[PDB]
Amino acid sequence: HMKVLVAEDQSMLRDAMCQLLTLQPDVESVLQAKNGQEAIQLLEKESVDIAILDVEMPVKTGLEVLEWIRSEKLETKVVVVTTFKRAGYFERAVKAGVDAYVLKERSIADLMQTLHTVLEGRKEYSPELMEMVMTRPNPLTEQEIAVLKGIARGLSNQEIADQLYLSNGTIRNYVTNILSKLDAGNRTEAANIAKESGWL
Amino acid sequence: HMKVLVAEDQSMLRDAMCQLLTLQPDVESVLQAKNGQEAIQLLEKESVDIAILDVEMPVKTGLEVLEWIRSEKLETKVVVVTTFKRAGYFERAVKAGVDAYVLKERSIADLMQTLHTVLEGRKEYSPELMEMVMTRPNPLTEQEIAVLKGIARGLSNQEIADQLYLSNGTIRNYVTNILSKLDAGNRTEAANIAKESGWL
């Protein structure tokens, strides 16, 4: 039956994921890698049905591995695990068609449960992440977003104004509105918040 | 096993859902309610394992029913169904401890998977909803938001027009644009959707 890849740089996480996979009835073989470049190389070697990929791997991250798998059109389901709650990581993973996304708030047993969900053909985005992050969507208007992108690119207000055909005045306002909606102290915090959040 | 209740104000869709659920081997019975008050009346008389509730119904909304169930502390699992139109009610659903928040347009097989998931004590939020919520910007402009805040506090068009220093005709066109942007039937419903979605 199933061939499963674990790519996980933390020795205890890796060994525990592998050891619980050996108890799953529909698993016939387990492959492991401690970084993303090693994971890609095993994917060049062997057919894999499902892979667990840790976003915090060195060399190449689990998001890069996911993207490579999808670029290659491999018939491999992908479960990504991460400690971080940044929506930007989640967004990046959704853009590459991740099958499941799990936080390290979860146990190894929970992770196995997600593995079966994905094997039965369904996606599974972390409930608790969705509760924490998705319930606070981008409040910015299309214009406010265009301004914020300007700021993140390092533009001044006059520069932003000229590009958009608007008064220097109007831009500082937009900025004021952005800082308020994002409860941010300055232009830089504002942009950081949107970049971390994947608001571009 | 399951005693189900379906609350849904489009009658043919309600009928279709109950017809198909009743035919499932896992379902012992299905109760029908055409609005949320009717569902509450049924939950007070009958044992129910799982309630399926349209986000929007007359008298009491699906969210109001869910709120009532949690406040009376019933042991009922609750699945709210929605369309993209009301994707942003996700946070009000989470605040009330919804077990699942899923797409209304899905097959009987998919809905039965939701039912089993929630019965086993897990949550299920549709991947498609989560993506839309994450991705969609605020569709309104700053002036549109100002207009809607007026509408939320009961203002006529003339009163908003007077406070904004704009013509009555301008305000009607803004309301028309807003109604179109939110896919809303009336000004009240526009205000609600915008509030709930995070956009005011």
Side-chain angles (χ1 to χ4, degrees):
Chain A
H1 229 119
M2 302 285 142
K3 164 139 46 146
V4 181
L5 169 64
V6 178
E8 175 53 70
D9 54 301
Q10 285 185 72
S11 176
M12 288 190 283
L13 287 184
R14 187 173 60 248
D15 276 356
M17 287 171 187
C18 293
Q19 196 278 143
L20 253 36
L21 287 160
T22 68
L23 317 183
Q24 312 303 126
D26 64 330
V27 174
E28 216 255 30
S29 73
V30 186
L31 298 175
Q32 51 85 207
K34 67 175 179 308
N35 77 41
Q37 203 49 55
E38 282 177 15
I40 293 170
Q41 276 187 19
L42 295 163
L43 299 156
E44 285 175 341
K45 265 165 161 38
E46 325 218 356
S47 181
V48 173
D49 295 283
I50 188 154
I52 302 169
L53 306 181
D54 193 306
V55 179
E56 290 69 73
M57 290 188 289
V59 188
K60 295 287 186 40
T61 76
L63 293 176
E64 293 174 303
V65 175
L66 163 61
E67 295 168 337
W68 182 92
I69 293 165
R70 295 275 179 259
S71 288
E72 291 305 293
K73 303 185 189 176
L74 290 177
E75 290 279 281
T76 299
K77 302 297 186 38
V78 176
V79 181
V80 159
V81 194
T82 190
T83 74
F84 296 104
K85 265 88 100 305
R86 308 195 159 187
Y89 290 0
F90 178 71
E91 191 176 321
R92 178 158 178 198
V94 174
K95 283 173 177 176
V98 74
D99 300 292
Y101 195 99
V102 179
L103 304 173
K104 296 187 195 151
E105 295 184 350
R106 293 286 38 87
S107 58
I108 309 280
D110 291 332
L111 179 59
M112 299 293 103
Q113 226 281 337
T114 307
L115 193 120
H116 290 288
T117 293
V118 166
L119 292 170
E120 283 151 34
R122 304 194 324 163
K123 288 190 174 89
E124 194 186 89
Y125 297 157
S126 162
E128 69 258 30
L129 183 64
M130 296 308 93
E131 297 159 9
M132 294 190 267
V133 190
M134 224 43 276
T135 48
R136 287 149 50 219
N138 187 173
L140 306 174
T141 68
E142 168 184 73
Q143 290 288 101
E144 279 160 1
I145 290 160
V147 176
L148 220 211
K149 283 177 177 174
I151 295 153
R153 295 201 291 104
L155 270 32
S156 79
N157 291 352
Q158 188 42 260
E159 292 173 346
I160 294 172
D162 295 331
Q163 290 197 204
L164 287 179
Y165 327 101
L166 311 156
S167 64
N168 194 301
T170 300
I171 300 309
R172 192 187 27 83
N173 283 356
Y174 270 131
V175 169
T176 289
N177 281 73
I178 290 160
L179 305 160
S180 163
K181 295 188 184 192
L182 282 58
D183 186 52
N186 57 56
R187 303 156 58 83
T188 302
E189 202 174 275
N192 285 333
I193 284 162
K195 169 152 180 143
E196 287 188 70
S197 290
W199 298 345
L200 195 49
Chain B
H1 319 147
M2 302 167 208
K3 306 163 165 71
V4 180
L5 181 158
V6 171
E8 170 58 58
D9 73 28
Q10 193 222 95
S11 293
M12 198 176 71
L13 175 67
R14 186 183 49 261
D15 188 61
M17 287 168 76
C18 302
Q19 176 197 144
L20 302 175
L21 286 158
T22 292
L23 293 160
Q24 294 282 316
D26 267 304
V27 178
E28 173 193 316
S29 56
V30 188
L31 282 40
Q32 266 198 71
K34 310 199 180 73
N35 68 59
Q37 192 60 57
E38 188 166 34
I40 288 169
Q41 297 316 292
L42 290 174
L43 290 161
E44 284 159 356
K45 261 161 289 316
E46 203 103 342
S47 73
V48 180
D49 293 323
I50 320 167
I52 308 171
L53 308 172
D54 192 307
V55 270
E56 171 74 14
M57 298 182 276
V59 192
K60 295 297 172 46
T61 69
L63 296 184
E64 289 173 313
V65 175
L66 163 71
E67 295 162 345
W68 172 86
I69 289 178
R70 304 288 184 238
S71 81
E72 309 305 322
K73 314 177 191 306
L74 306 196
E75 280 182 354
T76 306
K77 301 293 178 191
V78 184
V79 177
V80 173
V81 308
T82 185
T83 68
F84 283 143
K85 182 182 164 166
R86 293 186 186 87
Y89 287 57
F90 175 54
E91 162 147 70
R92 185 175 177 163
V94 167
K95 285 177 170 183
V98 74
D99 302 292
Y101 197 69
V102 294
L103 285 173
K104 185 161 58 169
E105 171 37 43
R106 287 189 316 143
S107 63
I108 185 69
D110 282 0
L111 176 58
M112 284 319 295
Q113 187 49 63
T114 305
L115 269 37
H116 295 304
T117 292
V118 299
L119 266 198
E120 300 188 80
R122 300 192 315 286
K123 301 283 171 29
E124 185 178 306
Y125 307 135
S126 286
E128 297 90 350
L129 285 181
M130 296 307 88
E131 184 174 46
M132 174 66 85
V133 170
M134 164 176 68
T135 295
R136 203 173 48 175
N138 196 336
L140 302 172
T141 65
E142 290 185 341
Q143 285 288 79
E144 283 170 345
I145 291 161
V147 160
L148 270 180
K149 298 183 193 291
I151 286 168
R153 62 189 186 93
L155 292 202
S156 88
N157 280 348
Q158 189 60 58
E159 295 169 308
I160 292 169
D162 297 347
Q163 300 207 320
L164 284 48
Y165 291 91
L166 292 177
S167 69
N168 190 296
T170 298
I171 299 301
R172 330 226 129 205
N173 290 358
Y174 291 1
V175 180
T176 300
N177 292 333
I178 283 155
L179 263 41
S180 172
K181 279 176 186 202
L182 299 180
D183 192 349
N186 53 86
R187 68 210 282 107
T188 290
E189 180 187 79
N192 294 152
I193 293 184
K195 190 297 257 186
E196 295 292 2
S197 315
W199 291 331
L200 312 176

